[PDB]
Amino acid sequence: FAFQAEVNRMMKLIINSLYKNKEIFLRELISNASDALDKIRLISLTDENALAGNEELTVKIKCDKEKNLLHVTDTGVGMTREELVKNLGTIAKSGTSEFLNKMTEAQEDGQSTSELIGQFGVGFYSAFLVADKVIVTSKHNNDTQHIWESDSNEFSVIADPRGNTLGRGTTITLVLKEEASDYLELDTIKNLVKKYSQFINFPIYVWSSKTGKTVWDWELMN
Amino acid sequence: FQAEVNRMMKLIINSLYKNKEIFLRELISNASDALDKIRLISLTDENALAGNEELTVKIKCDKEKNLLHVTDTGVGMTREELVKNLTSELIGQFGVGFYSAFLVADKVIVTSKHNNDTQHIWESDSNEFSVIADPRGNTLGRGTTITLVLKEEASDYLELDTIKNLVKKYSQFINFPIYVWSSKTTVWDWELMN
Numbered sequence A: 001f002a003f004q005a006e007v008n009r010m011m012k013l014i015i016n017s018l019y020k021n022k023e024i025f026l027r028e029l030i031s032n033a034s035d036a037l038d039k040i041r042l043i044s045l046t047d048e049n050a051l052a053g054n055e056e057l058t059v060k061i062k063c064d065k066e067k068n069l070l071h072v073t074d075t076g077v078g079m080t081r082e083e084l085v086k087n088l089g090t091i092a093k094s095g096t097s098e099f100l101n102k103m104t105e106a107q108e109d110g111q112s113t114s115e116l117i118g119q120f121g122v123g124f125y126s127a128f129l130v131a132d133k134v135i136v137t138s139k140h141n142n143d144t145q146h147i148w149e150s151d152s153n154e155f156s157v158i159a160d161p162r163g164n165t166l167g168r169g170t171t172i173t174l175v176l177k178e179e180a181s182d183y184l185e186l187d188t189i190k191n192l193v194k195k196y197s198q199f200i201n202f203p204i205y206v207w208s209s210k211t212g213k214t215v216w217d218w219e220l221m222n
Numbered sequence B: 001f002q003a004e005v006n007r008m009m010k011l012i013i014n015s016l017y018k019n020k021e022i023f024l025r026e027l028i029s030n031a032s033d034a035l036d037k038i039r040l041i042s043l044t045d046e047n048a049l050a051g052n053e054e055l056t057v058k059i060k061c062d063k064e065k066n067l068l069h070v071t072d073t074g075v076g077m078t079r080e081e082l083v084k085n086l087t088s089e090l091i092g093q094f095g096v097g098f099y100s101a102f103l104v105a106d107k108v109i110v111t112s113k114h115n116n117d118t119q120h121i122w123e124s125d126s127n128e129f130s131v132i133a134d135p136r137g138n139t140l141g142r143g144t145t146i147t148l149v150l151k152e153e154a155s156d157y158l159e160l161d162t163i164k165n166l167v168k169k170y171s172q173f174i175n176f177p178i179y180v181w182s183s184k185t186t187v188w189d190w191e192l193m194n
């Protein structure tokens, strides 16, 4: 079944080329972190134990130029295993069969090419504009911490062997594409975060340097 | 096989709806960008606009020869750029980029004059492409004319009102004026669209 996948994975390397300002991926991840935070914040106004697993309400972004990773972590509501599998699984599972089905449905639905290419730039799936692989670690008050992985073709999920390390919340880890290396640059990340966090009701930080040796810590962006 | 996989994706891409009118949006876009580059340059290079003082986009229709002309007084392209700046085809299938012109044209002719070279003419039918120095010499001043030899089924674009509507439809946020060689009570002249 290697051929069909060759067409599939290729069909994307081409569509990903239509996006000039792929930076929007960060905007979508911020937005989701914001939603998750609003959900648990809202719940806490009715349930005094809701924040027990982790009292802070923040979004924290960090770059790992060595591993070529970008981490976006929020202490929002988090997702249960079922949620990772259905809310992310079906969303990011556009393999050989899924990809084709959406196209035929799009073919008969009348869904123009525009509406199609546009789907690549909105929501969680927009992460794939700059990443070959997305790893999602999440902990929701109603379940144990789990890990979900996908390369936009398939997805897998297993209980985090490390246990509850998030307290509550979600970390989005992006294994960046060679050409998306700019998103590993501190100056690039700070500017964008500052750009897309103007309307979040929560503090957004970026792990940064501050000079007396050079030390690193969370720098508030909004 | 590269060629194999390519055609495969091609039919697939076209197996979906796409209002071919989007070709114009793409030409308007490219013109706007060309004008931006020279506009900026003119802020540092005092005589950058010497070749042609205006910064515009003028659309002309020739229902006789079945041709659509999109001329801008942007930065233009040198012979090298013509050859170089002109995955692109597939991208064209999505109605994006220079190649979107082939969604409506069997042949595309590009005339361009850049301050650093002489006027040249580039020509292509999507398969092969040719380039030669313009016999007429420098007639654009500076800028680029995209000439589309429209496909029979695309002759609808040659209609005045159709082109005007399409232009207005995609020139709302362009930082430069866009005209269409129109007529009025008969008199003929350029008519602003944005």
Ligand SMILES: [Mg+2]
Pocket (backbone or CB within 6 Å): A028, A031, A032, A123, A124
């Ligand atoms: Mg979202």
Ligand SMILES: [Mg+2]
Pocket (backbone or CB within 6 Å): B026, B029, B030, B096, B097, B098
């Ligand atoms: Mg373009």
